[PDB]
Ligand binder design. Structure first.
Ligand code: HEM
Ligand code: HEM
Lengths: 145, 145
């Protein structure tokens, strides 16, 4: 149930998501690439999914990876903006899942993003509390996969 | 070239884009659905492309349509935010075009969105001058299709 998962986003969780997002969301290009490069470093077994992006080890220098990384941050921007209305949050998460489902990305696969997020947050001085909050948002997406 | 197209975005054009976007982009759910509904109303032939969305005549009530309309607006949010750096605008546009090319959407088909955009702008009192500005942004994407 995606709705039950969204119900886990309590007042405190939503507050922490916004506070952290105010910082990491201000530099979508920088933090977006950092998130992807950390994913490829910690989970090399996922690189096979981004073969269209060429040599992802190039990081910021790869124009295809940079385009994907920036675009990725706008999906998160969308989720944060829908935190007030769970009905809209759910419909945008299901729309989001469509393409990832077509790519055969399973919930187990997607959950691997939690590590990179925790590390990116940490580099910006955000601790456990914030990593946990984001883990709850990702859970909503997983329930839709 | 997508890069050459991005050159049409002069200072005055980028100004009208941001000014108009501050308004139509302030209500993504509302205007986003207006864009889609207007598209289906004036260009019935495009309804076949969105069969996944189910019954698009339901408008706001259709969760799938609402989810798509809100997500669509964040693609435009992305373009607007990259206006000052042609390099970033280009890579995000090419990324964006990937899925639309796989769906067989030609540059001419995509251009059909100009009509709906014009009307949505007009509903907020933004005249031909702004419509033309947006037509140039859409042209950038067309250069990649
Ligand atoms: C917070 C996590 C994530 C976000 C916000 C995110 C966001 C996005 C967005 C916005 C797109 C572009 C639109 C589309 O094609 O659907 C996309 C594409 C893609 N995503 Fe996700 N994604 C995330 C995690 C993942 C993970 C963990 C995988 C795989 C293990 C994955 C694999 C893909 C692939 C392969 C593409 C296509 C890239 C390309 O060819 O350009 N995504 N994702
Ligand atoms: C202002 C122009 C437009 C924007 C910003 C836009 C944005 C988007 C976005 C963000 C997606 C979701 C990610 C993905 O590509 O899978 C999408 C999907 C799609 N777009 Fe575009 N689009 C635009 C115009 C059009 C037009 C004119 C057509 C065709 C007449 C079109 C056909 C499609 C289709 C068929 C989908 C998949 C919908 C589904 O089955 O869920 N788009 N578009």
């Amino acid at each position: 149930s995606v709705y039950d998962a969204a119900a886990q986003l309590t007042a405190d969780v939503k507050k922490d998501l916004r506070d952290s997002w105010k910082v990491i969301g201000s530099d979508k290009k920088g933090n977006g690439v950092a998130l992807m490069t950390t994913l490829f470093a910690d989970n090399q077994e996922t690189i096979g999914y981004f073969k269209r992006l060429g040599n992802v080890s190039q990081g910021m220098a790869n124009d295809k990876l940079r385009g994907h990384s920036i675009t990725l941050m706008y999906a998160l921007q969308n989720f944060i903006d829908q935190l007030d209305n769970p009905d809209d949050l759910v419909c945008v998460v299901e729309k989001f899942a469509v393409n990832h489902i077509t790519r055969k990305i399973s919930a187990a696969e997607f959950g691997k993003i939690n590590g990179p997020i925790k590390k990116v947050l940490a580099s910006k001085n955000f601790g456990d509390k914030y990593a946990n909050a984001w883990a709850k948002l990702v859970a909503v997406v997983q329930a839709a996969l």
